Amino acid sequence: AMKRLLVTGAAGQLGRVMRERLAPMAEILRLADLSPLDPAGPNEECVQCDLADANAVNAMVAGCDGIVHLGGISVEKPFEQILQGNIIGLYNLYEAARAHGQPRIVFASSNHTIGYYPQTERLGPDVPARPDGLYGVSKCFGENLARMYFDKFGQETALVRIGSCTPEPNNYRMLSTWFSHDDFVSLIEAVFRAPVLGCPVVWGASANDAGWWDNSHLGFLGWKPKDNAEAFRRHITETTPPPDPNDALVRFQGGTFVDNPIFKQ
Amino acid sequence: AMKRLLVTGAAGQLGRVMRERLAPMAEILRLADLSPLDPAGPNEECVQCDLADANAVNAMVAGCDGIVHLGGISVEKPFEQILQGNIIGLYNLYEAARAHGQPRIVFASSNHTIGYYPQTERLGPDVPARPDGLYGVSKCFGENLARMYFDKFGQETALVRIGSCTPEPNNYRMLSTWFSHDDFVSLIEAVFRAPVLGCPVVWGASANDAGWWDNSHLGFLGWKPKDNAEAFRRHITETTPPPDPNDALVRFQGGTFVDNPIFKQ
Amino acid sequence: AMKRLLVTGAAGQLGRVMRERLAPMAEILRLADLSPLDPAGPNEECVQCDLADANAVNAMVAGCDGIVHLGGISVEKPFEQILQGNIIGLYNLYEAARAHGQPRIVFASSNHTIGYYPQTERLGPDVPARPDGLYGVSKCFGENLARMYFDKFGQETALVRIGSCTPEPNNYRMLSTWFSHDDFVSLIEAVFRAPVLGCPVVWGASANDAGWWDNSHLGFLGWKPKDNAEAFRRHITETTPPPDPNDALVRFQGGTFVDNPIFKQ
Amino acid sequence: AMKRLLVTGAAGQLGRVMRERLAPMAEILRLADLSPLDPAGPNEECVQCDLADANAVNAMVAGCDGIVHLGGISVEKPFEQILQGNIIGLYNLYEAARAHGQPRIVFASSNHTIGYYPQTERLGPDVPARPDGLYGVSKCFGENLARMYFDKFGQETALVRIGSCTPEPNNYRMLSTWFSHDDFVSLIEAVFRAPVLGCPVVWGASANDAGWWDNSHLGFLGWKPKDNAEAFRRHITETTPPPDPNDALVRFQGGTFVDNPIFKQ
Amino acid sequence: AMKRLLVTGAAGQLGRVMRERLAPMAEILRLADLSPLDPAGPNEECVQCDLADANAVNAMVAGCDGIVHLGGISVEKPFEQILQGNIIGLYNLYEAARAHGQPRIVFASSNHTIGYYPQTERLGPDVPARPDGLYGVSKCFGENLARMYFDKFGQETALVRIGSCTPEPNNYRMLSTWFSHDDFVSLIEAVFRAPVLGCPVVWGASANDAGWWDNSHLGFLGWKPKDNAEAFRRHITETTPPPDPNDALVRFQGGTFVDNPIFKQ
């Protein structure tokens, strides 16, 4: 398909998955991370750079026809680290894209943007943010920044609020939040194939019977996830303690992130 | 089941399909069009007449237990043609029905009633009209008139906003708008079998993954389309040039109709 | 405010009021009607013609900087008459405007576009039309046509759904529908001063305690009606017979129009 | 799932089904009814008593881990009888639950809480009640009371507005209201397994093509009905007389209950 | 105007006010209460009776052209008292009205029907009930019953959810809930004068700046309260201790009723 697809955060959990899974989407896959990467194989380029380094980011993006942006701080951490990877880093990514043809972006946002909602409430894409920590707040920043770039310059971005992207559901919450590898891959393919995308909020979950999120307004994209966490309900009962009804795990959409304090360095 | 079903526009694309598919629905199928009709077979009656001719429309409707109204100007044309076929014609149709037992009507409205909406916007049945030309405006007229006859006299009509009712999806837009022959046929069956219909807006599309329209409020009818344009995405990608993101074809729900000028004779 | 303002339907009830009240809005007031006009005074031009005649409408509009479109059939009548003044006439008006610099239009639409709603239901501008006769259907046509010209060519129109524009309220329904001369004049002023108008639905009523309609989304125009029909309640109670609860007058927003039959020539 | 499950109304139509179908859900099934119960088998306890008698209800509930509350007056009857089983009985049940560890409750509410809505209107869980008789009003009382106990004490209840829970659909209305035994059993299972339930309104219907009700906001429970009344349409069409369009059966969601008078003792 | 107006609860706080204020509304005022009533003056009739006594309620209502129903248990009490006065009592009232020409009813419902909502949430008339006790639940019963009689028989009722109808606002909550005597009186006048009423929910509050409730949909009645609790903020600040932010008084719309236990005799 496209000539060069950039995957940031390529040394991380989802990154290593996409390095393999997204290979067929582009002639060249460019992997990037602040961490060392397994050496480039055929049809790969590998880049080491800090998202906080504007010039390095510019060079990282130059020549790419698309970006799957997975790089950054992925859990609650002290402000200083989140500022670097998720705030400053987002600005640098969007400036870099703006300078190099505005390649379409799949932004790994997070359920933690809305982590304080009760699990009993079904959410559409326009609900007000209720971030469950500094991490969630920084993902909101990425979303607001992407939106401004879309309105101002036409830069297109899929704001994918990922639930739990794992090999399989492994706790009660994931019966709702699970986002299979296959379904995330198919979403990415649907996002790049669209003639027109805009800057939509996308709920990153598989077709789970217990899902909390409404993607119906994204119908124009033609993406229907195929996996269903519900198949794993018995597996969960036979491999974990039953949740305590007072556990954040079953009370808040962000689960135990709500229990995180403000971490300090 | 019913004694006599009138199909107008019977010489056109859809009319020819329905002349065949709807036969099982009535002892007699009365076919009508302004254009020459293939001669009547057994259990058929053929009438060639102009919808703008009130007396002719009266005789066309007399003795009919139902009407599938496909007849009229079907594309953007100069005002006078549309006035005759779609405005005067609709008034004549409704008066004729009113004088002859108010046979239930399936009205072929159009997506062009809402053609100026962006394709990214999901639409429910109550959205304000945004017609994309004189043709669209005239289909709005049909919907408004039918509603008035419903409220005033109890005349029942299904206002079917047809997307693209063709043998197969042919382009990117039809991945959203396609309305299979089978699904239109089952809709008509569902409309006529209903003890109570009212005057509902019905979105005329199959169960397409990329559909833009929400038919959920029509649930009482018990009609669920079974076809899905998504099955053709690959095929369309393989046999047609990728749309330009600036083409009305992938920007507006009415596709290229928004680009139509006002046509003059 | 402007060089020349066209007032159509200038011989009619509202026309005669606006001929006097709108004089200060332009250097020249052009008055037009199908019927004879009192002779042009200083600062006036008068033209007698039929909206159904394109050449005449073209001349009527040429050189005008704005149009207050009051001309047309104003009550339920046979379809033939409505077709001329309200359907053909509207097409002609919009084509003439399009050929002559797209002067901003105040369109006299009508409450009868929604006449079948119960009086107990409060309506915002986006409710589905429920016209109470051919007249109401024809005003819907005007709205649909104007919206199409706005979306296609940028022609701006205020779709004013007039309640009862009279010297004073004189029945129970008018405690809700009354639209004072002063408040209609001020709306017209606010419509023409606006740098940007669009094609908004506007509910044409004064600030009546018993009003049925919500103009809040029109706030950007900065128009606040100042009269209030409520002040006339006692007068009406003493001057008129109490309404029968089964009377259309107190059951439908369109009042007795719902009781109109289809009139024939 | 639990040590002891109480099933009230166990002698009635649904009671007899649940006595068999819910056995696997608990070590001990306690069956209760005003009327005589078939003798307790292994793993059963049986208690015959009136919900109107607090001491008896206290004993009935004590030691139970969950309650499926089917007991009460199930059709329109004189107020006196409804008062006992459905009003006084409900207060007693909730007080007994409050005194005995607040075992989770599945409440058999009813479609008759909203029986006066037209069949053409799709309903979400928050619609205002429109009860079609004293019976419907009494089920509303149950819902209101349960909600109060939830907000005040945390007592959790599933307010199941049952459509028509029968072996199969046997009339036109049931194509929309049918609630299969299997789907009710699976709902009960999903209600009791949930770590958190709250006090949700639940529409009690299978996955019928012609369904009137929207359970989407209940998604967090992970319950998806699997049966579909639509499969019985032909059978019903051939086995029963076509409904008269003026019949309450096809006009109101409560069907013929709207035609019930107020019955007197 | 009307021949005879029944006021129940006439011995209570509000009843005493209305015995005086409503006199001008009818030739005869029939006052009723279970408690001793001051003896009847000219143009008065006094009846001392229990609402739970069906025969008594029948005679109380017979010959009355309207009813202001203030009678019943007015605070949280044990179930039996509320059952008699507010549940059995309401059934009796509605049956009595049904047997005697369906005199229009002003029903004193209560804010306690929705007492568990946060004070920060603005409420429209269709919000789901959240009663804060047995008293609240019983007022819900009244609303549900009245609605059923409306739908089934056409009996009209104003369901007035009274906030705090007192001579003046006394505390912080009353800055939002206050309903002046004058405004309640004008509401009642507006209710009875209306040709068509229906069975509307009415929020019983004056035009308070800090009001929580939206009466806009009641516009057709033409009732606009004129008093405003805000005028008393200073005074309340000056003469009462500032509320603790944790007090139900400033946390829940039902104020301290949420803190009520279930009272036993």
Place this chain on the structure above:
Amino acid sequence: AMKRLLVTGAAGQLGRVMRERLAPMAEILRLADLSPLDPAGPNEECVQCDLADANAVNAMVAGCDGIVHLGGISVEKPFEQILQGNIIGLYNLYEAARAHGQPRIVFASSNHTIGYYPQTERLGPDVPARPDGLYGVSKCFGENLARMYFDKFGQETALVRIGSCTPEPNNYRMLSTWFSHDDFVSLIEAVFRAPVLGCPVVWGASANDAGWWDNSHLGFLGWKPKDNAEAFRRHITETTPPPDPNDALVRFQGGTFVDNPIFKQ
């Protein structure tokens, strides 16, 4: 009232106004800014500190019972400066408050959080953000951060999206966006007096006839602005050129901010 009120940005435009206007609200007014302040008068303390300096911010806040946070970058600027004053600075402010009793905060947010909405659209507090530059994005950051602190720790904040806080409206946009000094002062007083605030979005505008924003859901606060920009419409026509309809000034709620590029250092 309170002992010590902090006003940040006290050397700026609004700061100098509030230094004077808010004096009566507290025994001690503490003014802070990165810029030099006019020396402390009686009942004033003056502090010089960079919002980016965590320790200085801690000391700035310690001992204050309330904060009006006006300090930060107030217009579109390069990222580096906005990062310091509006992002890092916001984190430091919220940490400082959290360490010192969580004094209630009035946050100067901005209309520029929603600057890309058309002026024709009326906005409620829950609309999705559409920031019109880096500045707007940073105000969104402050809002999301404040919300997280509220959900996590109970920190209360008024998120005041200020329109144009000036001595008087001085262009066409300000007929909609004007926020008088008096009305901002009264809002601040209303915010601090509330027993319960939460973390509400507040639209910072006076009671302008041409206002675009809906504060109705904030009714519980009891704040009604008293000034009206509409009084200044003639003043505006007589002191400025009429707006060009294509000017951002009359097309976007953020006015010419939409025209700002990304500024670089």
